[PDB]
PDB file of C-alpha atoms and ligand atoms in Angstrom:
ATOM      1  CA  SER A  30      -8.017  -4.920  -3.877  1.00 36.77           C
ATOM      2  CA  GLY A  31      -5.932  -3.916  -5.465  1.00 37.68           C
ATOM      3  CA  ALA A  32      -1.981  -4.510  -6.578  1.00 38.66           C
ATOM      4  CA  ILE A  33       1.282  -3.475  -7.704  1.00 38.79           C
ATOM      5  CA  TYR A  34       3.545  -5.528 -10.472  1.00 38.28           C
ATOM      6  CA  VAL A  35       6.681  -4.364 -10.789  1.00 36.19           C
ATOM      7  CA  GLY A  36       9.597  -6.403 -12.449  1.00 34.81           C
ATOM      8  CA  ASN A  37       8.121  -9.683 -11.182  1.00 35.43           C
ATOM      9  CA  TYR A  38       6.716  -9.078  -7.675  1.00 35.80           C
ATOM     10  CA  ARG A  39       3.826  -7.955  -6.881  1.00 34.15           C
ATOM     11  CA  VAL A  40       2.936  -5.737  -3.825  1.00 32.55           C
ATOM     12  CA  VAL A  41      -0.469  -6.237  -2.327  1.00 32.94           C
ATOM     13  CA  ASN A  42      -1.454  -5.194   1.858  1.00 33.11           C
ATOM     14  CA  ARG A  43      -1.026  -8.475   4.037  1.00 38.13           C
ATOM     15  CA  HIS A  44      -4.052  -8.459   5.003  1.00 36.88           C
ATOM     16  CA  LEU A  45      -5.703  -9.592   1.622  1.00 35.05           C
ATOM     17  CA  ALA A  46      -2.682 -12.237   1.034  1.00 36.88           C
ATOM     18  CA  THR A  47      -4.567 -14.083  -0.976  1.00 34.67           C
ATOM     19  CA  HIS A  48      -2.864 -18.613  -0.337  1.00 32.67           C
ATOM     20  CA  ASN A  49      -1.032 -18.220  -3.698  1.00 31.19           C
ATOM     21  CA  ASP A  50       0.563 -15.110  -2.664  1.00 29.49           C
ATOM     22  CA  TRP A  51       1.481 -16.996   1.019  1.00 24.48           C
ATOM     23  CA  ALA A  52       2.991 -20.225  -0.852  1.00 25.98           C
ATOM     24  CA  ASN A  53       4.941 -18.221  -3.286  1.00 24.42           C
ATOM     25  CA  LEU A  54       6.044 -15.739  -0.452  1.00 24.55           C
ATOM     26  CA  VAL A  55       9.490 -13.246  -0.735  1.00 27.80           C
ATOM     27  CA  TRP A  56       8.625 -11.057   2.705  1.00 28.01           C
ATOM     28  CA  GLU A  57       5.543 -10.176   4.287  1.00 26.93           C
ATOM     29  CA  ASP A  58       5.126  -6.857   7.322  1.00 26.45           C
ATOM     30  CA  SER A  59       2.598  -7.313   9.721  1.00 25.69           C
ATOM     31  CA  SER A  60       3.245  -4.196  10.858  1.00 27.98           C
ATOM     32  CA  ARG A  61       3.281  -1.717   7.949  1.00 26.06           C
ATOM     33  CA  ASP A  62       0.299  -4.005   6.779  1.00 24.08           C
ATOM     34  CA  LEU A  63       2.202  -5.353   3.321  1.00 25.49           C
ATOM     35  CA  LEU A  64       3.266  -8.397   1.524  1.00 25.02           C
ATOM     36  CA  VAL A  65       5.124  -9.510  -1.741  1.00 25.85           C
ATOM     37  CA  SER A  66       4.897 -12.753  -3.768  1.00 27.84           C
ATOM     38  CA  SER A  67       6.625 -13.448  -6.865  1.00 27.84           C
ATOM     39  CA  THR A  68       5.358 -13.695 -10.480  1.00 25.64           C
ATOM     40  CA  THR A  69       5.653 -15.693 -13.309  1.00 23.05           C
ATOM     41  CA  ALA A  70       5.035 -12.330 -16.055  1.00 23.01           C
ATOM     42  CA  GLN A  71       6.386  -9.316 -15.605  1.00 21.27           C
ATOM     43  CA  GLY A  72       4.570  -6.319 -14.285  1.00 21.93           C
ATOM     44  CA  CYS A  73       4.899  -2.615 -16.040  1.00 23.35           C
ATOM     45  CA  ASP A  74       4.555   0.004 -12.819  1.00 25.53           C
ATOM     46  CA  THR A  75       8.094   1.790 -11.884  1.00 25.70           C
ATOM     47  CA  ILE A  76       8.482   2.418  -8.215  1.00 22.90           C
ATOM     48  CA  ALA A  77       8.814   5.930  -6.854  1.00 23.97           C
ATOM     49  CA  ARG A  78      12.206   6.688  -5.878  1.00 24.06           C
ATOM     50  CA  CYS A  79      11.301  10.435  -3.968  1.00 25.11           C
ATOM     51  CA  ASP A  80       9.989  13.025  -1.158  1.00 24.72           C
ATOM     52  CA  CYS A  81       7.093  13.473  -3.300  1.00 22.36           C
ATOM     53  CA  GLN A  82       4.085  14.416  -0.757  1.00 23.41           C
ATOM     54  CA  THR A  83       1.264  14.822  -3.503  1.00 23.10           C
ATOM     55  CA  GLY A  84      -0.313  13.057  -5.489  1.00 24.89           C
ATOM     56  CA  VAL A  85      -3.020  10.989  -6.664  1.00 27.13           C
ATOM     57  CA  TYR A  86      -4.978   7.899  -5.725  1.00 27.55           C
ATOM     58  CA  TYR A  87      -7.252   5.672  -7.399  1.00 24.88           C
ATOM     59  CA  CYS A  88     -10.609   5.373  -4.699  1.00 25.47           C
ATOM     60  CA  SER A  89     -12.898   1.728  -6.002  1.00 24.06           C
ATOM     61  CA  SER A  90     -15.326   2.364  -3.484  1.00 25.31           C
ATOM     62  CA  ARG A  91     -16.141   5.873  -6.178  1.00 24.68           C
ATOM     63  CA  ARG A  92     -14.713   4.388  -9.425  1.00 21.03           C
ATOM     64  CA  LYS A  93     -12.309   7.338  -8.853  1.00 23.53           C
ATOM     65  CA  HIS A  94      -9.042   9.356  -8.850  1.00 23.13           C
ATOM     66  CA  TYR A  95      -8.339  11.854  -6.312  1.00 23.81           C
ATOM     67  CA  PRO A  96      -5.178  14.879  -5.741  1.00 24.66           C
ATOM     68  CA  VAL A  97      -3.952  14.565  -2.432  1.00 27.57           C
ATOM     69  CA  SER A  98      -1.193  16.070  -0.159  1.00 29.14           C
ATOM     70  CA  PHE A  99      -0.987  13.435   2.141  1.00 26.34           C
ATOM     71  CA  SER A 100       2.492  13.568   5.447  1.00 21.33           C
ATOM     72  CA  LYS A 101       6.098  11.362   5.240  1.00 23.37           C
ATOM     73  CA  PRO A 102       6.231   7.866   6.126  1.00 21.83           C
ATOM     74  CA  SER A 103       5.285   7.261  10.163  1.00 20.42           C
ATOM     75  CA  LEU A 104       4.174   5.245  13.185  1.00 19.64           C
ATOM     76  CA  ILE A 105       0.666   5.842  13.205  1.00 20.32           C
ATOM     77  CA  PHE A 106      -1.730   4.522  15.463  1.00 21.85           C
ATOM     78  CA  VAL A 107      -4.209   2.699  14.416  1.00 21.45           C
ATOM     79  CA  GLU A 108      -7.097   1.298  15.557  1.00 21.13           C
ATOM     80  CA  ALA A 109      -9.142  -2.472  16.037  1.00 20.62           C
ATOM     81  CA  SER A 110      -9.863  -4.097  13.579  1.00 18.10           C
ATOM     82  CA  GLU A 111     -11.378  -7.440  11.937  1.00 18.03           C
ATOM     83  CA  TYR A 112      -7.619  -8.226  10.559  1.00 18.76           C
ATOM     84  CA  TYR A 113      -5.489  -6.909  13.335  1.00 18.73           C
ATOM     85  CA  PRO A 114      -5.536  -5.851  17.334  1.00 15.77           C
ATOM     86  CA  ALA A 115      -4.675  -1.756  17.949  1.00 17.34           C
ATOM     87  CA  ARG A 116      -1.902  -0.551  17.415  1.00 16.97           C
ATOM     88  CA  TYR A 117       1.212   1.489  15.743  1.00 17.39           C
ATOM     89  CA  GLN A 118       1.047   0.814  11.954  1.00 19.62           C
ATOM     90  CA  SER A 119       4.939   1.434  10.662  1.00 20.43           C
ATOM     91  CA  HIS A 120       6.122   3.590   6.863  1.00 20.56           C
ATOM     92  CA  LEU A 121       1.936   5.149   7.098  1.00 20.46           C
ATOM     93  CA  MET A 122       1.557   8.375   5.730  1.00 21.88           C
ATOM     94  CA  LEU A 123      -2.434   9.781   5.857  1.00 17.64           C
ATOM     95  CA  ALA A 124      -4.348  12.386   3.695  1.00 17.71           C
ATOM     96  CA  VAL A 125      -7.453  13.849   3.801  1.00 16.25           C
ATOM     97  CA  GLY A 126      -9.698  11.358   0.863  1.00 17.66           C
ATOM     98  CA  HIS A 127     -12.413   9.077   1.348  1.00 19.71           C
ATOM     99  CA  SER A 128     -11.965   5.376   2.503  1.00 20.17           C
ATOM    100  CA  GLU A 129     -13.764   3.176   2.943  1.00 18.28           C
ATOM    101  CA  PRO A 130     -13.975  -0.831   2.938  1.00 13.62           C
ATOM    102  CA  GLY A 131     -13.363  -2.486  -0.971  1.00 11.78           C
ATOM    103  CA  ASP A 132     -10.738   0.009  -0.409  1.00  9.94           C
ATOM    104  CA  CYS A 133      -7.026  -1.345   0.429  1.00  9.54           C
ATOM    105  CA  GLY A 134      -4.412  -2.042  -1.934  1.00  8.77           C
ATOM    106  CA  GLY A 135      -5.819   1.551  -4.912  1.00  9.86           C
ATOM    107  CA  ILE A 136      -2.635   2.155  -5.823  1.00  9.82           C
ATOM    108  CA  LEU A 137      -1.464   6.104  -4.853  1.00  9.32           C
ATOM    109  CA  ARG A 138       0.686   7.327  -7.185  1.00 10.58           C
ATOM    110  CA  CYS A 139       3.078  10.709  -8.137  1.00 11.74           C
ATOM    111  CA  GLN A 140       5.397  11.601 -11.391  1.00 13.25           C
ATOM    112  CA  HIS A 141       8.031   9.205 -10.103  1.00 14.45           C
ATOM    113  CA  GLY A 142       6.024   6.507 -10.558  1.00 15.98           C
ATOM    114  CA  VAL A 143       3.899   4.240  -7.438  1.00 20.03           C
ATOM    115  CA  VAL A 144       4.503   5.003  -4.216  1.00 19.74           C
ATOM    116  CA  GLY A 145       2.004   3.652  -1.969  1.00 17.71           C
ATOM    117  CA  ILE A 146      -1.161   1.197  -1.354  1.00 16.78           C
ATOM    118  CA  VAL A 147      -4.485   2.187   0.548  1.00 17.63           C
ATOM    119  CA  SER A 148      -3.864   0.872   3.512  1.00 17.53           C
ATOM    120  CA  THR A 149      -6.261   2.762   5.819  1.00 16.46           C
ATOM    121  CA  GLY A 150      -9.533   4.732   6.063  1.00 16.51           C
ATOM    122  CA  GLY A 151     -12.538   5.840   7.976  1.00 18.53           C
ATOM    123  CA  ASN A 152     -13.026   9.469   9.218  1.00 19.58           C
ATOM    124  CA  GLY A 153     -12.454  11.127   5.677  1.00 19.82           C
ATOM    125  CA  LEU A 154      -8.589  10.540   5.562  1.00 21.05           C
ATOM    126  CA  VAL A 155      -7.584   7.757   3.442  1.00 19.39           C
ATOM    127  CA  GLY A 156      -3.572   6.453   5.078  1.00 19.52           C
ATOM    128  CA  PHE A 157      -1.121   4.388   2.498  1.00 20.09           C
ATOM    129  CA  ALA A 158       1.800   2.356   2.995  1.00 21.88           C
ATOM    130  CA  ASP A 159       5.169   3.463   1.080  1.00 24.38           C
ATOM    131  CA  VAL A 160       7.194   1.364  -0.504  1.00 23.73           C
ATOM    132  CA  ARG A 161       9.386   3.318  -1.904  1.00 21.60           C
ATOM    133  CA  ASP A 162      12.334   2.720   0.492  1.00 22.93           C
ATOM    134  CA  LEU A 163      12.002  -1.144   0.082  1.00 23.85           C
ATOM    135  CA  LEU A 164      15.045  -0.429  -2.842  1.00 22.72           C
ATOM    136  CA  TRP A 165      15.091  -4.630  -3.833  1.00 20.96           C
ATOM    137  CA  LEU A 166      11.601  -3.694  -5.697  1.00 23.13           C
ATOM    138  CA  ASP A 167      13.741  -2.580  -8.349  1.00 22.88           C
ATOM    139  CA  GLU A 168      16.328  -5.526  -8.697  1.00 21.29           C
ATOM    140  CA  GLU A 169      16.108  -9.125  -9.422  1.00 23.38           C
TER     141      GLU A 169
HETATM  142  C1  LIG B 271     -10.010   0.831   5.397  1.00 23.96           C
HETATM  143  S1  LIG B 271     -11.605   1.407   5.304  1.00 23.96           S
HETATM  144  C2  LIG B 271     -12.587   1.148   6.735  1.00 23.96           C
HETATM  145  C3  LIG B 271     -13.582   2.383   7.175  1.00 23.96           C
HETATM  146  C4  LIG B 271     -14.544   2.591   8.713  1.00 23.96           C
HETATM  147  C5  LIG B 271     -13.105   2.655   9.975  1.00 23.96           C
HETATM  148  C6  LIG B 271     -12.247   1.452   9.397  1.00 23.96           C
HETATM  149  C7  LIG B 271     -11.313   1.293   8.167  1.00 23.96           C
HETATM  150  O1  LIG B 271     -10.721  -0.185   8.295  1.00 23.96           O
HETATM  151  C8  LIG B 271      -9.277   0.835   8.182  1.00 23.96           C
HETATM  152  O2  LIG B 271      -8.435   1.289   8.564  1.00 23.96           O
HETATM  153  N1  LIG B 271      -8.767  -1.126   8.045  1.00 23.96           N
HETATM  154  C9  LIG B 271      -8.548  -1.667   8.669  1.00 23.96           C
HETATM  155  C10 LIG B 271      -7.596  -2.932   7.168  1.00 23.96           C
HETATM  156  C11 LIG B 271      -6.659  -3.206   8.124  1.00 23.96           C
HETATM  157  C12 LIG B 271      -5.953  -1.478   7.811  1.00 23.96           C
HETATM  158  C13 LIG B 271      -4.479  -1.267   8.480  1.00 23.96           C
HETATM  159  N2  LIG B 271      -3.615  -0.811   7.329  1.00 23.96           N
HETATM  160  O3  LIG B 271      -4.304  -2.024   9.651  1.00 23.96           O
HETATM  161  C14 LIG B 271      -7.295  -1.426   9.254  1.00 23.96           C
HETATM  162 ZN1   ZN B 272       7.255  11.851  -6.651  1.00 23.59          ZN
END
């Protein structure tokens, strides 16, 4: 589990969104596994606006932050799960790192700010949903 709190927005994995997130919905995209809801309090995270392909992510199943090299956002095939059928997920970046269930929502960050959140795992790989192109998270 986990979320990004920027401005008056809460960014979560669409597959882990709560009823309150759906009742206060700003934007959602199943092809990216992302959902954004509105918040009453202001958040403290800042979004990275950069081209970093190295950073650090939080792994809840290890209580640890790991440094990783990750691929550029791309269209990647993700196996059928209990949340989605087999499909291509867009704006997904892969790295070598542990990831198991408990773990979407952990933040990936660089020196510029938050890059994205854990969205896929298994096989000694970890995948992250990029948020750096969502410029509107910085306004309103
Ligand atoms: C993420 S850990 C898990 C490890 C065992 C193998 C499967 C791994 O699950 C995933 O990759 N998922 C499940 C939740 C939805 C994700 C998505 N964004 O489509 C895909
Ligand atoms: Zn950066």
